[PDB]
Structures are given as structure tokens and as C-alpha cells.
């Protein structure tokens, strides 16, 4: 069942991986409305597709900034992987294309906003609320990992809540197709596994660490390791002593000690039983994994939505003109985009 599912999931993925989609829209097919969010470099805008009238989220990447930050390969990774995957909690890439100055990835617009904003506004999530989101990340990582994909940037800022209150994972910027180990220092400081930090080489178990960080932060309202600067955070991660809010249930604490486990022979996700050590953990005992995949569970929270194009679940951002030069920049570098 899971085996037949993942197997055919894999054949579908490989066909798209081997022959990616290219150039399925162009800039003037869309009206740009408002910025939805921004990252290290580059921004996401709410746009309206002229001919269909549908709204989308358009991620704009300046090729020159990509090159300068040395993210060419990661950007090619991002698009090649996002156009090939298919899972109920992964955001859909609807179009991609490039022009003289920029790379564009047009996704389904997920109007409920970032988990981040809700989390900070509300304070923290009760354990059943946190568990419901966590479950979706567990299933998503089972899917991804099965394709030899590592995700590498789990955090509430890259998690979107859809109109049904379910999660949509976005930002495949550091996603990578790798069998065995890899070495890139990347992710977000609060979420980095200690082996990433220690320059050891690392594998997919870093996504299970990050899940532990996510679950903690969701339930606590603050991360397990915080400080004012990254370097202080790394220190605390490397120590690995973790302390839990007084309100955490015994089950939750036990799960987190097994995810935020500095020892890879003992971290959940990374063992002989694989994801089942997580799915069968006591904290998830009330979770109907089939029902979650099927999206039949009642969400704990359903965002307010006032008609298409509403951005009220998102912060406001400074807008700025998207330039497009008359000279092609970095054409060769991004040919396969």
C-alpha cells in the first residue's frame, strides 16, 4: 500500500526529473499586484493571470543576485525538483519561465498566510493543533525522502496554510536530489542539525532534526535554541542540551528527545524502522495517518478568506520595480531553467 504508492509516486517523479518542464508562461501574461513575502534575496508577488483571471504567487529571482550568492546550482535544483513532485501538502508549481533579468516560478497562491505569522500572533499552538501540522510534515518527508530528496529548510516561514487549514510546503530553494551524503552549509540557523554545523557531511536525517525543532517551536511558541546571533545559536545546538516548557506533555518531550537527538544511530527517522518510529510514537497515537493524507481530518484553524486576491493574512512589504534589461544576463548558467 504505502509501498505500491511510493513506487508509482517514484516513476512519476523520475519522468519529470529526467525531462523537466520549461518556459510555460511569460511575464506579460500576468498583472503583478502586491508583494507577499521576501527571502534572503528575491520576492514573491501575488499576481493575476490575464487570460484565466486566476491568482498566483510569483517568485521572482534576480539572476545576478543568484550568481553573486553562488546559488546557481541550488536554484536549478529548486525548479527542477519543484516541477517534478506531486503531494497534497506540497505547493504546486503552475508555471516557470525566465527573461533577460529574472527567473520566475509561478505557484498556486496559498491565501492563509505563513504558519509563522499565526504562530507569533497566537503565541503557540496547543499540542493537538501542533500535531495536526506535524503529521503533514512527517508524510511529506516520507514522500520526499523516498525520492532521494532532502528538503533542508523546514520552518514556519516556509509553511503556508491553505483555505482548508492544511499545510502547503513552499521554498524548495535548498532541496536536493542526493543518495548518501552532502556538505552544504545551508538552511536557517535555528533549524540546523548539529552535523550540518560541524561540517561533517550529512544526510536526510537533518530533515528529521528540523522537524523536532518545528514541533518544539509550534508547541512552545519559541525555538529550542535561540540567541541574538547565529553563532550563539550554533553553540547551543552543538551542546544539545534542550529544556522543555512546563506545559509540554510527557509524550511530546519523549518524541522531541528522539528527534533532537545529536546521535544519528538514535535519531528517529534515521533508524532501521524509518519513519514508523515517528508515526507509531505515543504522541501521534490519536493521529489517523490515512485520514490526514486524504485531508479528511477537521483542521484546528481555518483562515479568514475574503474573496480571491485577498492578502490580509500576509504582512505588508515595500514594493519595488521589477527591472528587465535589454541584455540577456547569465544566459548560459541558466539554460536548463
Amino acid at each position: 500500500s504505502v509501498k505500491e504508492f511510493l513506487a508509482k509516486a517514484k516513476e512519476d517523479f523520475l519522468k519529470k526529473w529526467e525531462t523537466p518542464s520549461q518556459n510555460t508562461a511569460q511575464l506579460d501574461q500576468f498583472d503583478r499586484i502586491k508583494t507577499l513575502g521576501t527571502g534572503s534575496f528575491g520576492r514573491v508577488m501575488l499576481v493575476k493571470h490575464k487570460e484565466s483571471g486566476n491568482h498566483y504567487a510569483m517568485k521572482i529571482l534576480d539572476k545576478q543576485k543568484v550568481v553573486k550568492l553562488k546559488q546557481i546550482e541550488h536554484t536549478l535544483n529548486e525548479k527542477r525538483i519543484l516541477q517534478a513532485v506531486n503531494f497534497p501538502f506540497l505547493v504546486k508549481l503552475e508555471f516557470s519561465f525566465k527573461d533577460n533579468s529574472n527567473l520566475y516560478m509561478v505557484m498556486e497562491y496559498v491565501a492563509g498566510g505563513e504558519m509563522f505569522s499565526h504562530l507569533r500572533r497566537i503565541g503557540r499552538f496547543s499540542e493537538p493543533h501542533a500535531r495536526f501540522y506535524a503529521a503533514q510534515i512527517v508524510l511529506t518527508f516520507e514522500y520526499l525522502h523516498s525520492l532521494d530528496l532532502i528538503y533542508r529548510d523546514l520552518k514556519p516561514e516556509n509553511l503556508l496554510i491553505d483555505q482548508q487549514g492544511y499545510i502547503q510546503v513552499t521554498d524548495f530553494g535548498f532541496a536536493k536530489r542526493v543518495k548518501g551524503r552532502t556538505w552544504t552549509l545551508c538552511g536557517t540557523p535555528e533549524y540546523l542539525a548539529p552535523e550540518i554545523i560541524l561540517s561533517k557531511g550529512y544526510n536526510k536525517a537533518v530533515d528529521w532534526w528540523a522537524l523536532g525543532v518545528l514541533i518544539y517551536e509550534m508547541a512552545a511558541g519559541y525555538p529550542p535554541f535561540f540567541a541574538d546571533q547565529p553563532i550563539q545559536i550554533y553553540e547551543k545546538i552543538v551542546s544539545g542540551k534542550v529544556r522543555f516548557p512546563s506545559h509540554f506533555s510527557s509524550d511530546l518531550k519523549d518524541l522531541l528527545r528522539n528527534l533532537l537527538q545529536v546521535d544519528l544511530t538514535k535519531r528517529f527517522g534515521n533508524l532501521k524502522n524509518g519513519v514508523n518510529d515517528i508515526k507509531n510514537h505515543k504522541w501521534f497515537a490519536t493521529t489517523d495517518w490515512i485520514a490526514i493524507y486524504q485531508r479528511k481530518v477537521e483542521a484546528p484553524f481555518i483562515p479568514k478568506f475574503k474573496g480571491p486576491g485577498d492578502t490580509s493574512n500576509f504582512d505588508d512589504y515595500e514594493e519595488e520595480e521589477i527591472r528587465v534589461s535589454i541584455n540577456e544576463k547569465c544566459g548560459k548558467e541558466f539554460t536548463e531553467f
Binding site: 534572503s40 520552518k155 536557517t188 535555528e190 511558541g221 519559541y222 535561540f226 541574538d228
Partner: peptide, 20 residues
């Protein structure tokens, strides 16, 4: 409290990815 210390810290807003 831990909460109070986090909230007074400078990383309570959206966090940027690193690629150090």
C-alpha cells in the same frame, strides 16, 4: 521566563535562510 527572553531578543521576526 524563557518566553520573555525570546520576545526581547532580536530574532522574533521572519528568519532569513543562510547558505554560508
Amino acid at each position: 521566563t524563557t518566553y520573555a527572553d525570546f520576545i526581547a531578543s532580536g530574532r522574533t521576526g521572519r528568519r532569513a535562510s543562510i547558505h554560508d
